[PDB]
Amino acid sequence: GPGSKPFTLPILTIGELSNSRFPVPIDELYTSPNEGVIVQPQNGRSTLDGELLGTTQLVPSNICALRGRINAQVDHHQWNLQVTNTNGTPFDPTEDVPAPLGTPDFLANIYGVTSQRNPNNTCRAHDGVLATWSPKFTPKLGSVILGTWLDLNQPTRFTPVGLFNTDHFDQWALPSYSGRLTLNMNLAPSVSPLFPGEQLLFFRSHIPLKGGTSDGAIDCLLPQEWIQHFYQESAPSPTDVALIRYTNPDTGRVLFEAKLHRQGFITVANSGSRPIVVPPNGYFRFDSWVNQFYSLAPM
Amino acid sequence: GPGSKPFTLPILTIGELSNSRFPVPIDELYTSPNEGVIVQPQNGRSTLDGELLGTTQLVPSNICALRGRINAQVDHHQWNLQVTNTNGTPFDPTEDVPAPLGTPDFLANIYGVTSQRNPNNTCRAHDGVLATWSPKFTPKLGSVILGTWLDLNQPTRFTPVGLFNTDHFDQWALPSYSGRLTLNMNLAPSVSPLFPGEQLLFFRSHIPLKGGTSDGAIDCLLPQEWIQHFYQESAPSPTDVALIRYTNPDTGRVLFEAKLHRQGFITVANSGSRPIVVPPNGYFRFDSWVNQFYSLAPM
């Protein structure tokens, strides 16, 4: 067709979406005022024309994963991992990113498995914890600590599974990527509704918790598939806001409408903290470009 | 443009691809004659015009995952899981699929984590083994056995991590989805090169192994992203074979060419079992439609 490539959403139902901040499926849509909180995730960040931001990368299984080599042993239950990029290349701290792509963007004791394969194909794997709140969590400097309950200088991967416990768990608190005394850099910006009566719309997952009491909520601004889609398409954004409507393809009915902002987040006309139920066959549909002053029908 | 949607590949480097048969990144390209083996994976199967086959579904984190409820305990280290679909809907055994979508398609002791969340948000998770070779591995009948080292009638998920050990491990041996005495049904067909001098080209990952000696090779016919891409695009296939060339975008050089078949697999002109090294910035490029008798340049 003529002119600029048209903007599109992938056609995916809620059961066909992945969380972009933790490697699990989306469970539900959620809206909240998030009173008192700065919402600034670094994974799951992209503009509508496909510019990845923060620590966002494309591979779902690399989300919250770490890769590298163990150079030493701390505390015999702790190991020093010299981080590389999730794709194998060494990590250059001078790169204009907050941390290696896919690095966890929240404070937690992350339950996972540390595994190695030696050149002679002898292997080991042990479950353990990655403490992203720890003073020794310094991925931007090129190292983190892995805990276990391992061979030195062998190819190593940490596969995240969930939360070990609820201690230190704050999904909206960023890690100190270079350690506690150092500023984070090259961050994706914080996000907020800019129009009165509006709240953020999240794609929510409830991640596994080894022990304790929590809904384990991880909220992402965009599902991983949307990010992958925008990256491929790279469709220009004529205005700052795309108008999207959640549509039931069978009936043709529109359940609600939302603002998809150019910087990569969604707002809806709603109030309070609540899950938003959608039909299993329904999906978001891009209808037209509008501006920041468009007035959404209340949900 | 005019006429039928044009066929395209997503532009993704090898470091930007996911395995469609196990939830891990692609490590390398691999080719092999696979002498003596029937190559019939059920995950990672799609036609070029986006028809998913076998047990293939879209969500990467649902690959080799299971979901359901535990109604009883066998052997107190064994639990009976009544499987649902990975998206939470109940599984109907009369559906025209070999098993619930995302069910593992190979024989192994799969190391993973079983987790639950109760309505009061009290949670537990324990690592364990899913034995896909077991007589009690009957997902098509609606049940499997989960091993641990758990609450009854609570929402349960098995998150795969890797191989517990190398026993029974055969990546090309399909499970008996309804148990040992029953035929598998609705299978994606076996695949083979149909032109002399040609071999299958695989997207290979080396998955974690808790203990033992193995390269842990899992070979998929198409990366998960290609499957997701074809599903969205649904571009018609004018002929049975698409001609693709691995191209270095910087230089413009073509390293090698391959046949991308309509049924969703790749062949190359090569011999023997060997890894195929590609430049980090390179990617497959669709150049034109050809037929089954096209003669590929030797690699």
Numbering used by the authors:
A (entry chain B), B (entry chain A): 221 to 294, 297 to 371, 376 to 525
Paper text:
The norovirus genome contains three open reading frames (ORF1 to 3), where ORF1 encodes the nonstructural proteins, ORF2 encodes the capsid protein (VP1), and ORF3 encodes a minor structural protein (VP2). The S domain forms a scaffold surrounding the viral RNA, whereas the P domain contains the determinants of strain diversity and recognition of attachment factors. There is considerable antigenic drift among human noroviruses, and new genetic variants evolve every other year, which can result in new epidemics worldwide. It is well known that human noroviruses bind with various specificities to histo-blood group antigens (HBGAs), which are present in saliva, on the surface of epithelial cells, and in mucosal secretions.
An earlier study by Huang et al. found that a GII.1 strain, termed Hawaii virus (HV), did not bind to HBGAs found in saliva and only weakly bound synthetic HBGA A and B types. HV, noro485, and SMV P domains diffracted to 1.86, 1.50, and 1.60 Å resolutions, respectively. In the HV and SMV P domains, we found two loop regions with disordered residues in the P2 subdomain, i.e., no discernible electron density, which suggested a certain degree of flexibility in these loops. The equivalent residues in the HV P domain were Cys345, Arg346, Asp375, and Gly438; in noro485, they were Cys345, Arg346, Asp375, and Gly438; and in SMV, they were Asn352, Arg353, Asp382, and Gly445. In the noro485 and SMV structures, Asp375 and Asp382, respectively, were pointing ~180° away from the fucose, whereas in the HV structure, Asp375 was missing because of the lack of electron density. In HV and SMV, loop B could not be modeled into the structures because of the lack of electron density.
